[PDB]
Amino acid sequence: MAFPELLDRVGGRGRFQLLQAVALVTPILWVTTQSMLENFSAAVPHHRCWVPLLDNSTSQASIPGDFGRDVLLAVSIPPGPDQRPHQCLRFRQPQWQLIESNTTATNWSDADTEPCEDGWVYDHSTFRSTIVTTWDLVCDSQALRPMAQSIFLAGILVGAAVCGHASDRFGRRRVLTWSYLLVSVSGTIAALMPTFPLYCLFRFLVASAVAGVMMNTASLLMEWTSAQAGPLMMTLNALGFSFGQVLTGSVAYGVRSWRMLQLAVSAPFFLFFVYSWWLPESARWLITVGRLDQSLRELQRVAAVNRRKAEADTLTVEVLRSAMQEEPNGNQAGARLGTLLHTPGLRLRTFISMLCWFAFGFTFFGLALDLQALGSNIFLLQALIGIVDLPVKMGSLLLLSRLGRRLCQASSLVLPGLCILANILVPREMGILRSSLAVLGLGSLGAAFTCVTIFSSELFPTVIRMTAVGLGQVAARGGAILGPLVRLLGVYGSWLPLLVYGVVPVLSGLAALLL
Numbered sequence: 001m002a003f004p005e006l007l008d009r010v011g012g013r014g015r016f017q018l019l020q021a022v023a024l025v026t027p028i029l030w031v032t033t034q035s036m037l038e039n040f041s042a043a044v045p046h047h048r049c050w051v052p053l054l055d056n057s058t059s060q061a062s063i064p065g066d067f068g069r070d071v072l073l074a075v076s077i078p079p080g081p082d083q084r085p086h087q088c089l090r091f092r093q094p095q096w097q098l099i100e101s102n103t104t105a106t107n108w109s110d111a112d113t114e115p116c117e118d119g120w121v122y123d124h125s126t127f128r129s130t131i132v133t134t135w136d137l138v139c140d141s142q143a144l145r146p147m148a149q150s151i152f153l154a155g156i157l158v159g160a161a162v163c164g165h166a167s168d169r170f171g172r173r174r175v176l177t178w179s180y181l182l183v184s185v186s187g188t189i190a191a192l193m194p195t196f197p198l199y200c201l202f203r204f205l206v207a208s209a210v211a212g213v214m215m216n217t218a219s220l221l222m223e224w225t226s227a228q229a230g231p232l233m234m235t236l237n238a239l240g241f242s243f244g245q246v247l248t249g250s251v252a253y254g255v256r257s258w259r260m261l262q263l264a265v266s267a268p269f270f271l272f273f274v275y276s277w278w279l280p281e282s283a284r285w286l287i288t289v290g291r292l293d294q295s296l297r298e299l300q301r302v303a304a305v306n307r308r309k310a311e312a313d314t315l316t317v318e319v320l321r322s323a324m325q326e327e328p329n330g331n332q333a334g335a336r337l338g339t340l341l342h343t344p345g346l347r348l349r350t351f352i353s354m355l356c357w358f359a360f361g362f363t364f365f366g367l368a369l370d371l372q373a374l375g376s377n378i379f380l381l382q383a384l385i386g387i388v389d390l391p392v393k394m395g396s397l398l399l400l401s402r403l404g405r406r407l408c409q410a411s412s413l414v415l416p417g418l419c420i421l422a423n424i425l426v427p428r429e430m431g432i433l434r435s436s437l438a439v440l441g442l443g444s445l446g447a448a449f450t451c452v453t454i455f456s457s458e459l460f461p462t463v464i465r466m467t468a469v470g471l472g473q474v475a476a477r478g479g480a481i482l483g484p485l486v487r488l489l490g491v492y493g494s495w496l497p498l499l500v501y502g503v504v505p506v507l508s509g510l511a512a513l514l515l
């Protein structure tokens with residue numbers, strides 16, 4: 001009297017699971033928007049130093065001679081490496097001699113300049129306001145954007161662990177509902193904080209609650225369906241993220257103020273919390289705990305939804321108790337973690353799987369948060385990453401059965417990897433080729449997440465299936481944290497952030513051939 005018999009009795013495929021899939025895949029879009037909002041709410045616009053001659057109208061009325069703004073800009077700001085007015089320093093004493101062309105304007109000492117003690121002036125053509133504009137994340141404070149992104153990712157990790165324990169102890173639907181509420185409230189609060197550390201802390205809390213939402217949605221979606229229909233709903237969950245990227249691009253185009261954007265993104269989660277109550281709790285977990293009457297209630301409700309009351313009429317507590325007894329025990333938790341690495345055969349298999357899990361977080365999140373440097377129109381780039389993800393993800397699974405198993409993993413990492421390395425070599429003059437390659441790079445890098453998830457289970461023995469995936473997700477989260485921090489190497493050179501992000505997938509993909 002195992003649970004699958006009962007689930008087949010009530011109805012495994014019809015109606016109810018479709019509605020549940022809709023109601024649980026809709027929030028994934030807004031989860032993706034919350035995750036990728038940092039690309040728009042923290043965009044760094046073009047800026048230059050504050051100059052009394054230009055910015056101040058009181059000094060504007062005192063200008064001797066009607067000189068054009070370009071001449072004043074050349075006078076007051078030293079030239080920069082890219083022929084632009086240099087960003088982080090200013091002329092002390094209005095240099096009039098620069099007007100004359102008789103002197104080669106190249107002999108300038110570092111003692112002739114001062115740091116911008118009077119703030120900056122930013123460009124407001126595209127973005128009305130970001131966090132960089134508000135709190136002056138410029139010059140000496142340019143290292144605090146990857147800090148914010150790493151704090152958010154660490155929040156995801158800690159929230160995943162804590163919510164895992166809490167959902168294993170209390171249930172699925174309850175933790176999911178309270179996670180919806182926490183996301184909404186924490187986002188609404190974060191949209192109003194005046195100082196940077198408060199913003200970082202509330203983004204941390206939002207990330208924790210988001211991790212809880214994703215985990216509980218995945219588990220509750222898996223536990224209510226027959227084993228034949230698992231990968232189909234995994235594919236639906238995967239497509240949710242691509243539609244979420246498209247939605248992120250659209251909403252970012254709609255609103256161009258970071259506080260309003262954050263409020264608009266964090267608003268619907270309260271609505272999700274409101275109707276999260278009507279969902280039924282997973283019957284398998286209810287059977288495991290020992291509250292049989294609640295299990296019978298959920299089973300009868302979901303059977304009545306599918307119009308299968310006649311088969312539900314025969315359900316009694318005895319078969320539920322038999323299913324309780326048949327459920328395997330998990331006392332072995334302390335044992336499988338060591339056995340994964342202590343086994344000589346399993347030591348190498350895990351590590352290469354670990355390295356493949358590591359490479360996804362390091363490369364994808366290090367680049368998907370820096371679309372400003374890969375092109376001009378970041379509204380269009382966000383849409384295309386979601387668009388290209390659809391044909392590639394579905395088109396890849398065809399090659400699984402035909403081209404084999406071990407070859408798919410190697411191609412799923414090398415080929416997106418070489419797209420990024422080609423971005424360095426190609427001249428910046430051909431911008432269209434630069435942008436199209438980056439779309440195909442990160443667009444095809446998402447297919448690695450799906451292929452590895454499916455392949456992880458089949459290799460390992462049935463005993464250690466769950467624990468093997470548990471390690472794999474940890475390296476993805478731990479690797480993603482180190483992603484943004486690499487951008488701090490950009491001071492040495494422009495090509496260094498791209499070089500490291502391209503070498504890791506090539507080594508990860510080629511090393512997977514030993515599996």
Ligand SMILES: CCc1nc2ccccn2c1C(=O)c1cc(Br)c(O)c(C#N)c1
Nearest residue numbers: 032035214215241361446473476477480
């Ligand atoms: C914020 C998560 C996220 N944002 C995007 C944006 C585009 C494509 C995919 N994602 C994801 C994930 O798929 C993902 C990452 C890690 Br790290 C996890 O631990 C889990 C879990 N559980 C899920």
